[PDB]
Amino acid sequence: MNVPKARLLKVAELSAKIFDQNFNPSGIRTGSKILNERLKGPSVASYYGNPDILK
Amino acid sequence: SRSVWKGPNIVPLPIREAMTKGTPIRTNARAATILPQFVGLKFQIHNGKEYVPIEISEDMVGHKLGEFAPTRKRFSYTQ
Amino acid sequence: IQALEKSLDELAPLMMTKTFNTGVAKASVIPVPLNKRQRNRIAWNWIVQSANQRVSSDFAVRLGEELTAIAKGTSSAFEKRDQIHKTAIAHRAYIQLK
Amino acid sequence: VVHILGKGFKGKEVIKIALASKFYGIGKTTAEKICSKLGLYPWMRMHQLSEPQIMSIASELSTMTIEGDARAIVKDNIALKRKIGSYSGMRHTLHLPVRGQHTRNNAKTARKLNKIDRR
Amino acid sequence: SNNIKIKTLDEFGRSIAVGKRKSSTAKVFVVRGTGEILVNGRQLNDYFLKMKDRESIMYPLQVIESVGKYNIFATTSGGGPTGQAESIMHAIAKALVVFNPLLKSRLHKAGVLTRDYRHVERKK
Amino acid sequence: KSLHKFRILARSRYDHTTDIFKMSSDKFEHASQNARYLHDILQRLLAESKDLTEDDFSDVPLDTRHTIAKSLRKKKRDYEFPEHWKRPEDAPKKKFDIVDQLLST
Amino acid sequence: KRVTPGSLYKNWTNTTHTAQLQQTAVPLALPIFNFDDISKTLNKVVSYSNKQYKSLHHLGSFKKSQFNELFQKPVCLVREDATNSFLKKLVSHPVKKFIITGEPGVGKTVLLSQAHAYAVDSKQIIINISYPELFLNGRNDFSYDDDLKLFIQPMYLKKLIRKILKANDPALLKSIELSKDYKFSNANPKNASVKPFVTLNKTKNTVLDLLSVMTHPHNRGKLMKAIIDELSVQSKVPIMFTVDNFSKVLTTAYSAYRNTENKQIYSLDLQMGKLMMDIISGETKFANGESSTILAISGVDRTNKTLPVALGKIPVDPYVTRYHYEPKFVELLQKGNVTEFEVPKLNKQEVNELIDYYKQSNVLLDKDITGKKWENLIDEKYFLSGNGNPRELLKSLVLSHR
Amino acid sequence: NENLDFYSDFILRTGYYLGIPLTGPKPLPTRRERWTVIKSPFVHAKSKENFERHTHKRLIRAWDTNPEVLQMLIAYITKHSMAGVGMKCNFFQRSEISLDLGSTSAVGQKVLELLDSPDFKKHLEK
RNA sequence: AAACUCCAUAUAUAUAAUUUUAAUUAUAUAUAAUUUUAUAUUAUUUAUUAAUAUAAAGAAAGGAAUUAAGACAAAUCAUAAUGAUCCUUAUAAUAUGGGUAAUAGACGUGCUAUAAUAAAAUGAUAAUAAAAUUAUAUAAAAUAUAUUUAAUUAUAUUUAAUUAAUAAUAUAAAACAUUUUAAUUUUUAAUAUAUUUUUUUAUUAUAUAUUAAUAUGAAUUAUAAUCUGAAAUUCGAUUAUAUGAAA
Ligand SMILES: Nc1ncnc2c1ncn2[C@@H]1O[C@H](COP(=O)(O)OP(=O)(O)OP(=O)(O)O)[C@@H](O)[C@H]1O
Ligand SMILES: [K+]
Ligand SMILES: [K+]
Ligand SMILES: [K+]
Ligand SMILES: [K+]
Ligand SMILES: [K+]
Ligand SMILES: [K+]
Ligand SMILES: [K+]
Ligand SMILES: [K+]
Ligand SMILES: [K+]
Ligand SMILES: [Mg+2]
Ligand SMILES: [Mg+2]
Ligand SMILES: [Mg+2]
Ligand SMILES: [Mg+2]
Ligand SMILES: [Mg+2]
Ligand SMILES: [Mg+2]
Ligand SMILES: [Mg+2]
Ligand SMILES: [Mg+2]
Ligand SMILES: [Mg+2]
Ligand SMILES: [Mg+2]
Ligand SMILES: [Mg+2]
Ligand SMILES: [Mg+2]
């Protein structure tokens, strides 16, 4: 808490760089969440079973 | 209430023809947000059965077209 | 504690008349004996009702005052006991004894 | 009894609570700021106030939107809804719920209070 | 053959017993001492705020009149204060029988050696 | 000094209590790819920690708030039997059994 | 009205404290507390002297929830590991700055009352702050003083100054002649309209005169600074400054008061907070070498890392939020070299003495006297009290009807 | 549990001959899943039937073994697996800090394509 | 049918290199009770007996499932499935919007409340649980804003660990302690007073109205912002300021 914010920001920025993380000090909404969400299409589209069944 | 940071709910509408010809805009997009450009233009807004004619004023900007085309009839009892 | 048990033993009625719906005719008011657990309930409810007429906001204080007055002889619930015992003495013949 | 801007207060009432209770438009947070601005300690009561301090409260209260002014803002916002013909305006005119509440049952409070000239 | 081996004090003179009540469990270490008790490393008055819970823990020692003759190191987990206090009570009673097996009958008669079976029942 | 800078830059990935630095990755589709990715990050973190020419972050103390939060979610049984309570003289003493003593000879 | 002159209308805790229920207690003849003859009273229950009772009542040494109403007057067990041990350190240690700790109800307040009793006997001037919450809860007036640059609290200061005057021997106060001339505004309703100010000349007036000055509320902060300065410059009489429930100060850095910007006022911006911490930190030095500063914590207050760090019991964690760690208080406490004295729990022999006194006071139930062996009772009550807690011992004896 | 325990016993026998120190099978907490249904097809929501499924778990640990021998164990026990038994294997490989040769998302690509299309470039023009 | 069972409980053995730790546990197997014995009393079909108590041994005190018959031609053709009969450019199929959310009265079932044996704050070396969930995810810590020293609450930024006896949802809550609490002049304040000092006593001021709605209650409503979604108008959730009904 007594650690100057400038010092703690330098650690955050360098740490984010090493760990390939997005450093957004301002907090602007960037949409990064949308880019990271998983694709659920394959699971959703198999709900009713494999269509290539022997008939 | 749509978050302000997302912007208006913009829908495809024929506004150019209504601004160069004065024709009414018939639409079912009741969710559409009345943008400041729409002011002065004439809209025919679906209510599920009919198309209600409404002209947009400056006190309607920000609201949505559906708000001005009631979908139900006033209730009455067989007293 | 000894004061509480003495007060409960003096205030609780020994017997109480109860109406039994025996027969299509009018019910009978027959005196019935009470056990110690049933006697304590009757006397405690009288104490609580008397306590809740006092001025203190705290129930513990009102209860404490009520219990102190009863341990010192003064209580309005002794009238209730006398009226329950009078009724039973009147209906002494209604008892069955078999 | 202490009188501030016509409102009457019992002497024992705490100032920060009394102000948010009798004055339309002033709540708990707003009342605390007024007392902090006038140097009144958090739990000071009305009977303690002097006449110079009673006048200071009235001055600060007269530089705010309260009572009629605050009530007029609500009445004018409701009137605008009716003027533009919005669905919400009709609900106010019909004395019906304006926030999506069901009407098959209940809806008693909306029937008593919902009106263009809302109190 | 039988499945019971005589219980005896351990290398440090301690009698170890486990007790259960509701969802709570307690493992106590009883040794000869002067009446010192520790519950999960904390003072009895700190861990158990209710005096009735403290009185429950002391009852088995009060039956054999040995409240000042033993040191108890009780460890308890699960359930609430009542389950833990009575689980410790049950475990102390079972641990006291090793010091004098002639007092088991008195402990059984007081009811401290009977495992309380009552638990929350899903409504049926 | 480099060990301190390493621990500061790891942030939530370092547990001071256990001294363990743990990082996982499932970003790629194959485990081999993910293994290389973690290895490459490890080399990058070590290089920065061993380059104290500009900043060593010695003024910055280690932050353990993440570890404290984790500890509050696990039950800690950190109490042991008092040593001054032990009574070794009350333990049972092995008895003399002639049969077992005679069966061994 | 529903309330009559003698009706018990308050809650239970206030009724027991205020209803004068000790009147029916039986008078017992106990030895008197005297540290100079502790050998004759060690490990025995003693009453205080008549001179000590008068001073300790004016200081607020006796508090509610101490079962004082069970006995004719409050009594204390002179303990070897708590009372005798602490008082010997107070007479020998050169710094004489202590903070009394221990588990809730262990007897920290009673120990402070025994230190007040010692000071009364040993001709010392006692300044006690019994309940610091009274100047931090925002329930009395406050004003900003430009000359002091502090928020003064006139209502509280008036009560505190009277306590210092009524609790201490007038002779000691009269001995301290004033070192400077002082002028204050006159608020005495007799000559206030005739004399604009009251002057206190040096070498003529004493600190007793200074403690009797009736001034306007806005000049009462300057009267508290003069009193403390006069008592800290004189070397004749030792000054014992005490604060009970000091944990409240350590855990309430920001008072309930708000400035003109609706910002809560830091406790060190109040004169009471600044004065208290100036004496503890050592900024305000007392000329007499027997002056002491005894602080005591209370279990009714929340705990955090402030006090443990100040006492050296745990390492400093810099990332602890300010609401759980106040580094400024730690600096002040460590600058004053405050040392901890942990009040130990009672041993079984001390429990025996207390229960033997309770039997003679007729406070024990009939279930603990008839049909129970004395040794069994002591063992049971030592177990049910947590192995020594005095407060849990009393509750097990007089407040456990199950 | 029956096939689970039998198969676990077989793994221990396979490991012994392969020279693999093995511990277990350690029983892990059984997971219980529950479903409550209404017995009637249409109405009568007052009579409800209970159903459950228990997942039985066992942990077998391998120690002080070379990777190649460990793979032989997994291959053999896979070849002779029992019905209705599943198997997860966590392998732990101790390595050196620095190694030799080591040990773009679809959405991001489409965003770049979309931001270059005329429907977007026509606005980005400054 | 009952029992024999299964669960719970007690105990024993096995398993865990006791850092997947809860060994005070996990879960496989086995054992145990439908308890047993002695004595006195009262009844008996009086004997090798029941009801009772007393003593002794014991951890032992609770549950589930367990099938046959018939009826209401009771519900369901709207979980799906069958006959008959009807529609086949429409009674089938798709899209956009609307409705299922309407409102006089009435009924069922709930929630919140109408204050002092009860509500509100605060409690960081962190009082004390169980059962569940996390690959169509659970989201830590930190930072920023509301917003104030900080905490708290909400959201944003960022996305650590864990696909799990490992990490996360999640420091359970009540309890308990302290403080506060309208009606209540049972209060507060100014002086003086005390051997009740967080307090007592005295004298002044502290309101009027008032069978009544407060610092109880939180319906209704204004404005601003936020969350999910392609979309929140009919018709969603949350927050802030203000509003503060009935009871
Ligand atoms: N030496 C003693 N002789 C007699 N009674 C004592 C003694 N010490 C403590 N007590 C009693 O124990 C109880 C608690 O005492 P005290 O109030 O001093 O404790 P405390 O630790 O200061 O409490 P808290 O943590 O609440 O501030 C009281 O009833 C007190 O009278
Ligand atoms: K208001
Ligand atoms: K509706
Ligand atoms: K209804
Ligand atoms: K373990
Ligand atoms: K709809
Ligand atoms: K309430
Ligand atoms: K929990
Ligand atoms: K009201
Ligand atoms: K909407
Ligand atoms: Mg990750
Ligand atoms: Mg947290
Ligand atoms: Mg104290
Ligand atoms: Mg039908
Ligand atoms: Mg419906
Ligand atoms: Mg905890
Ligand atoms: Mg967080
Ligand atoms: Mg976990
Ligand atoms: Mg907690
Ligand atoms: Mg609470
Ligand atoms: Mg309220
Ligand atoms: Mg009414």
Numbering used by the authors:
A (entry chain X): 1 to 55
B (entry chain S): 9 to 87
C (entry chain G): 150 to 247
D (entry chain M): 2 to 120
E (entry chain I): 140 to 263
F (entry chain Y): 214 to 318
G (entry chain W): 49 to 450
H (entry chain J): 52 to 154, 180 to 202
Could you give the paper's own sentences about this structure?
In the second dataset, we added a recombinant initiation factor mtIF3, and obtained three states: free SSU, METTL17-bound, mtIF3-bound. Specifically, we modelled extensions of the mitoribosomal proteins bS1m, uS2m, uS3m and uS7m as well as corrected the assignment of a guanosine diphosphate (GDP) to adenosine triphosphate (ATP) in the nucleotide pocket of the protein mS29 (S6 A-D).
The mitoribosome is essential for the intra-organellar translation of the 13 mtDNA encoded OXPHOS subunits in humans, directly supporting the formation of Complexes I, III, IV and V. Indeed, without intra-organellar translation, mitochondrial respiration cannot occur. METTL17 is a highly conserved mitochondrial matrix protein that has recently been linked to mitochondrial translation. Using comparative sequence analysis, mutagenesis, biochemistry and cryoelectron microscopy we show that METTL17 binds to the mitoribosomal small subunit during late assembly and harbors a previously unrecognized [Fe4S4]2+ cluster required for its stability. We then grouped particles from the two datasets and resolved the structures of the SSU, SSU-METTL17, and SSU-mtIF3 at an overall resolution of 2.3 Å, 2.6 Å, and 2.8 Å, respectively.
